[PDB]
Amino acid sequence: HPNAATSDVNVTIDTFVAKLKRRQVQGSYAIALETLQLLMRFISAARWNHVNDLIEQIRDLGNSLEKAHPTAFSCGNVIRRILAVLRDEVEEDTMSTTVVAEPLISSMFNLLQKPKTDYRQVAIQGIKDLIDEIKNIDEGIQQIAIDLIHDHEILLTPTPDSKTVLKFLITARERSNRTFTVLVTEGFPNNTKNAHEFAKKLAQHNIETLVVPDSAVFALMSRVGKVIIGTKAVFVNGGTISSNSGVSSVCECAREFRTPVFAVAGLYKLSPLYPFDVEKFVEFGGSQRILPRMDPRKRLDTVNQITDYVPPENIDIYITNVGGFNPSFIYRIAWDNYKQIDVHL
Amino acid sequence: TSHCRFYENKYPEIDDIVMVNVQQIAEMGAYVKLLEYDNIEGMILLSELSRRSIQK
Amino acid sequence: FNITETYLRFLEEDTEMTMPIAAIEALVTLLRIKTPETAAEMINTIKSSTEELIKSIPNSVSLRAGCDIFMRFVLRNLHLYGDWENCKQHLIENGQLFVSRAKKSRNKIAEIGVDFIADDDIILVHGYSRAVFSLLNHAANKFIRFRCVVTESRPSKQGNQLYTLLEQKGIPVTLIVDSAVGAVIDKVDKVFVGAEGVAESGGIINLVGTYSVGVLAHNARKPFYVVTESHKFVRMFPLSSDDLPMAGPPLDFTRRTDDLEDALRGPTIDYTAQEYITALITDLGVLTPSAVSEELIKMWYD
Amino acid sequence: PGISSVIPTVLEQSFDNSSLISVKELLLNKDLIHPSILLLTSHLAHYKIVGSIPRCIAMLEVFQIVIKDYQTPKGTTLSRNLTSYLSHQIDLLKKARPLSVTMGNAIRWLKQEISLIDPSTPDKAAKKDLCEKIGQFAKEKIELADQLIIDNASTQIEESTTIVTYGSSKVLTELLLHNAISLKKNIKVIVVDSRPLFEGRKMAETLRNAGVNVMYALITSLDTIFNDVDYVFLGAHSILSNGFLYSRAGTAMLAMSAKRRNIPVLVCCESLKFSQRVQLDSVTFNELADPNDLVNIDYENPVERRGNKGALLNQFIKERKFEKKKLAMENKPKGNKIGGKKGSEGESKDASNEE
C-alpha cells in the first residue's frame, strides 16, 4: 500500500518520508510533533461517511508509514494511541445504536464469546490529549527523582544523548546541602561529542565531574552505586531501545556487580508491538567514521553500530510521568494507551 | 432437634421470597440453608447474587 | 454422564485434536443434558464429574485446569440477565466452537510468531506440544534460516517419537540427552520449551525437566521460551522449589532388593519460575510479562 | 500543641535521611486532647508487643471511641473542624514516631467517609449508621483478610510442617496457633530474635503458654538449624509497588540464606497493606528510636545498673547508632497472598486498580 488514493487532500506524506530518510528532523519530540500535525491534516480534510471503512483506511495508512520507516517509534505510538482513543468512542456509539454492558470489572472471555455518526471532534480531542502527554516528561518525574540518590553515594552515567536524562541529572544536582560524585562514560564512535558537552555542562553546574575513558569502568566499579540508561524507545516486555552506543556493556557490568539499574524514558516512547528481534530494529552507523582511506580499505571491513538494545533482565524499574512501573507490568500500561485490534495492521 | 418447614409444603414456588443464612462462598456461589423455607440447602450462582468489594 | 470412558478413549491420539480440547468438548456435552439454567442440579454434577476426573488422573493438572476454565466461562455466560434461552443456546454452541477456535489460534500463531527467525539460529524444541511443532513447520515453510533439534526425553519414549516426526519433514536432525544438555550454552541459539499448562505468572507444567533448563539459561543469559496455543490457564502457585499433585513418589528410596521389583521413581513433573523466562508465546495478540495473571484476576475476582 | 525539640545526641554523619530525636513525660497538656492517644504514645515510646497490624487496629479503636465521645455542636457544624483535629492528631503521631501505610489508608478511608455523609442529615441517626459501617469495615479489611490468609495457608501447607518465622507478625502467630490446636498437626516452629527488640522471645513465650514446641535463635548464627529447615514465612510490615518489602531487622539476611540454600521464602499479607509509593534501598527512609536498647547489659529491659556502658558523649567521640526497618528483596519472596487469594509479588500492583 503506497500513495495512490491521495489527490488534493493530503500531500505531506512525501515530505514526512523525506524527513525520515535524509534526516532534516532531529529529536523524538520533533518527530512526534510532525506525526501529530499529519494526523490533524488527515482529520481536517479526509472524507468520512462510514466508520469501519475509515478505520480500515487509518490502518492502511499506519501500515504504509511502517513500511516507509522502522527506526521511528514515537510516530507510530502516537498514531496507535489516537486509534485507541477513536475505538472507545466507536464502541460507545455502537452501544447506543444497539439500544447489559458491565458486570463488575473489565473481564476476559471477550475474544471467545460474541461481543449519521460523529467522531471528528473526539479525534481532535485525542490529538490534544496526546500533545499534552508529550509536552513535558521531566515535569512529572523530578518529584520521584530527588528520592533515590543521596549524600556521599556515587553515580555511574552512560548515554547523555536523551534530552530527558540530562535534565533529570540537573534536577538531582540542584540542592546545596547534598553532595555526590558523577562518573560519565564516553561511547566513542557515535556519542563522544555529546558526552563532552554533558561533561562541560556538569562542570558549569558546580558539580564534581569525572571524565571516563570507555576502558576504565572496571578499575572504579568498587565505588559504583547507580546505573541509568539513556533510552529513546520502550517496548512490550519492558525492554528499551537506547539513544545509541556504549550502554550494553556497562549494563552487563552493573548486573555482574548487582549494582542498581534504573530506567528513565516516558510512556509516549512506549510501543504496543514486541521486539521480535534486535536485527530489524537496531541500525548501524558509518564505517567511514572510524578509519580513513578507501582504495586499500576494501580489505578493511570495519564494524560500527549506533542504536543499542538491552534485554528484559538487566532493567529493574521505570519511573514515568504517571509513576514507577515495572518490566513485568508495562503491558497493562500499553493496553491502557493502545487497544486490541489497533496493534495488528 | 431443629427441622421442619415454615409453610405447609416442603418445596418453594416461582416468584416467592425467601431469606437465606450463608455458610460458605466461592467456586459455585452460595449453596446455603434457608430460614424461610426448610433447613435443606438452596443454591445461587455467582451472577444473580450481586449487582453493583464483593468477595470481601 | 460418563467421563472415564472418554478418558480411556483419549491418551496417545492428539495430533488432529488436542487432548484437552476433547475433554472440554465432553464437558460441554455433559453440561448440555442437565440444563445450565437449573444451577442446583448442574454445578453439583459438574463438581462430581471433576472429582471423577481427578480420581482417574495419575500425573496431570491440565484437564482440571480446562474444566475450571469451562466453569468460569459458564459463569461469565449468564451476565446478560434478560432472556434465559439465548444464553443457554450460546452455551450449547460453545463446545465445537472451542474446537474451531483452535484452528483460528493456529492461523494467528502462523502470522505473529513467524517474525522471530533470524540469520543462523539453532532451535531446540522441548517436551511435547502440538502448537510448537506446528509453529516449527510454518517456519520451515517460510524458509527463514534455522535448525530443528530433538531430545532424549523419558516418559514413555516421547523424545524418540518427536525425532521420528521431525525426520518426516527432512530437516537435518541431531539429539540432546537430559544429561548432555549441559554442554549447550551458546551454540544452540535459543531455548524453546513446549507447555502442558500455564499458571499465574511464569508457572508452566511440562514433562521430566524444565526448571534445570531455565536455570541453565539464566546462567548463560540465554533467551528462554514458553510455546503454546490456547486452552491452558490455571490458578496455581507452589511454595518450595517444586510442589505439585503427584502419583509418582518424590525421592522414593526403594526398598531392599536383589531380583528387581520397583525402581523407576522420582520427580516426573516439572515447574518453572517467573525470572527464568524472557518470552511467552500465545496467539492472544502479543503478550509476555504477566498478562495471564491479569486475565485470571479479571476472570475469578476471588 | 505544647513543647517540641530540646534533646541530646548529634545529627550523625552516617545515615540521616529522616529526623532523629519528642513527647514522653507530660507537662502543660491542652484541654481538647483525648488522653487515650497520649497513653498510646507513651506505650509506643517503649513498646515490646505490637508491630504493624495490631497498631492500626488500636488506632481504629481509638478513633471509634473519639467518634462515640463527639456530638454535633450548635455553632460549628459536623464538618467544620473535625478534619483539622484529625490533621493535628496525625502531626502528633508523626512527632511521636513515624507511621505505616495501612494507617494512611485508614485515614484516607475516614476522610472519604466524612466527605460522603452530608451535614444536613439528622445527627443521631448519622453516627448510628457510621459507627456500624466502621465496624463492618474493620471486620472485612482485617479479620476477614486474616481468615482468607489462614484458608490460603491451609490448602498450600503440606501434611504437618516445620515452620520458621521472625518478629511479632501477629497474623502468622495466630495461624500457627490454629495449626497447633484447631486443625491439629505437628508444629516444629522456629523463632529468631535480635538484641534491641524482644519480640521473638515474647512470641515464643506466647506459644509456650498455648503449648507449642519452639526453637529460639539469635544473630550469631542461623545456619546451625538449617544444615533440615523445610518451609519458611518472613516478618511483614509494608509492601511497595516495586515487588519489594519494607520489613523489620535481619529478615533480608534470612531471605538471602534461604535463596542460597535449597528453598525460597513466602509472605502472606492483608489486602490493604499495599502502597503506591516506591523505594529500593535501606538508605531511603529509616525508622529510628533512641540508642538505649543495647546500653543495658542484656537480660531484661528495666534494670538500672552501675558498670561501664553509657558513653554517648562522655569519652573522646563515640556514636552508638542503629536501624529498625530495612529493605527486604524481590527475587526471593515469590509468594503474596491477600484478600484476592492467589498471586505473585512480581505482580506488584495488580490489585491496586481493583481494590
From Swiss-Prot, chain A:
GO terms for biological process: cytoplasmic translational initiation; regulation of translational initiation; translational initiation. It comes from the Eukaryota. Keywords: Cytoplasm, Initiation factor, Protein biosynthesis, Translation regulation. SUPFAM superfamilies: NagB/RpiA/CoA transferase-like. Its main location: cytoplasm. The keyword Methyltransferase does not apply. The keyword Cytoplasm applies. Signal peptide: none annotated. GO terms for molecular function: enzyme regulator activity; translation initiation factor activity. PANTHER family: TRANSLATION INITIATION FACTOR EIF-2B SUBUNIT BETA. Present with 6650 molecules/cell in log phase SD medium. Belongs to the eIF-2B alpha/beta/delta subunits family. This is Translation initiation factor eIF2B subunit beta. It comes from Saccharomyces cerevisiae (strain ATCC 204508 / S288c).
From Swiss-Prot, chain B:
It comes from the Eukaryota. Phosphorylated; phosphorylation on Ser-50 by the GCN2 protein kinase occurs in response to low amino acid, carbon, or purine availability. Phosphorylation inhibits the guanine nucleotide exchange factor activity of the eIF2B complex. The modification Phosphoserine is found at S50. It is found in: Cytoplasm, Cytosol. Eukaryotic translation initiation factor 2 eIF2 is a heterotrimeric complex composed of an alpha, a beta and a gamma subunit. The factors eIF-1, eIF-2, eIF-3, TIF5/eIF-5 and methionyl-tRNAi form a multifactor complex (MFC) that may bind to the 40S ribosome. Interacts with CDC123; the interaction is direct. Interacts with GCD1. Belongs to the eIF-2-alpha family. eIF-2 functions in the early steps of protein synthesis by forming a ternary complex with GTP and initiator tRNA. This complex binds to a 40S ribosomal subunit, followed by mRNA binding to form a 43S pre-initiation complex. Junction of the 60S ribosomal subunit to form the 80S initiation complex is preceded by hydrolysis of the GTP bound to eIF-2 and release of an eIF-2-GDP binary complex. In order for eIF-2 to recycle and catalyze another round of initiation, the GDP bound to eIF-2 must exchange with GTP by way of a reaction catalyzed by eIF2B. Present with 17100 molecules/cell in log phase SD medium.
Swiss-Prot record, chain C:
InterPro entries: eIF2B_alpha/beta/delta, elF-2B_alpha_N, IF-2B-related, IF_2B-like_C, NagB/RpiA_transferase-like. Gene3D superfamilies: Translation initiation factor eif-2b, domain 2, Translation initiation factor eIF-2B, N-terminal domain. Disruption phenotype: Inhibits GCN4 derepression in glucose, amino acid, or purine-starved cells. GO terms for molecular function: enzyme regulator activity; translation initiation factor activity. The keyword Disulfide bond does not apply. It is found in: Cytoplasm, Cytosol. GO terms for biological process: cytoplasmic translational initiation; positive regulation of cellular response to amino acid starvation; positive regulation of cellular response to heat; positive regulation of translational initiation; regulation of translational initiation; translational initiation. The modification Phosphothreonine is found at T288. Its main location: cytoplasm. One of its GO terms (cellular component) is eukaryotic translation initiation factor 2B complex. Keywords: Acetylation, Activator, Cytoplasm, Initiation factor, Phosphoprotein, Protein biosynthesis, Repressor, Translation regulation. Belongs to the eIF-2B alpha/beta/delta subunits family. Present with 8970 molecules/cell in log phase SD medium. This is Translation initiation factor eIF2B subunit alpha. It comes from Saccharomyces cerevisiae (strain ATCC 204508 / S288c). The gene is GCN3.
Curated annotation (Swiss-Prot), chain D:
Coiled coil: none annotated. Acts as a component of the translation initiation factor 2B (eIF2B) complex, which catalyzes the exchange of GDP for GTP on the eukaryotic initiation factor 2 (eIF2) complex gamma subunit. Its guanine nucleotide exchange factor activity is repressed when bound to eIF2 complex phosphorylated on the alpha subunit, thereby limiting the amount of methionyl-initiator methionine tRNA available to the ribosome and consequently global translation is repressed. Residues 342-352 have a biased composition (Basic and acidic residues). Its main location: cytoplasm. It comes from Saccharomyces cerevisiae (strain ATCC 204508 / S288c). GO terms for molecular function: enzyme regulator activity; translation initiation factor activity. Keywords: Acetylation, Cytoplasm, Initiation factor, Phosphoprotein, Protein biosynthesis, Repressor, Translation regulation. It is found in: Cytoplasm, Cytosol. The chain holds residues 237 to 593 of 651 of the full protein. Residues 328-355 are annotated as: Disordered. This is Translation initiation factor eIF2B subunit delta. It comes from the Eukaryota. Belongs to the eIF-2B alpha/beta/delta subunits family. The keyword Acetylation applies. Present with 10300 molecules/cell in log phase SD medium. GO terms for cellular component: cytosol; eukaryotic translation initiation factor 2B complex; guanyl-nucleotide exchange factor complex. One of its GO terms (biological process) is cytoplasmic translational initiation.
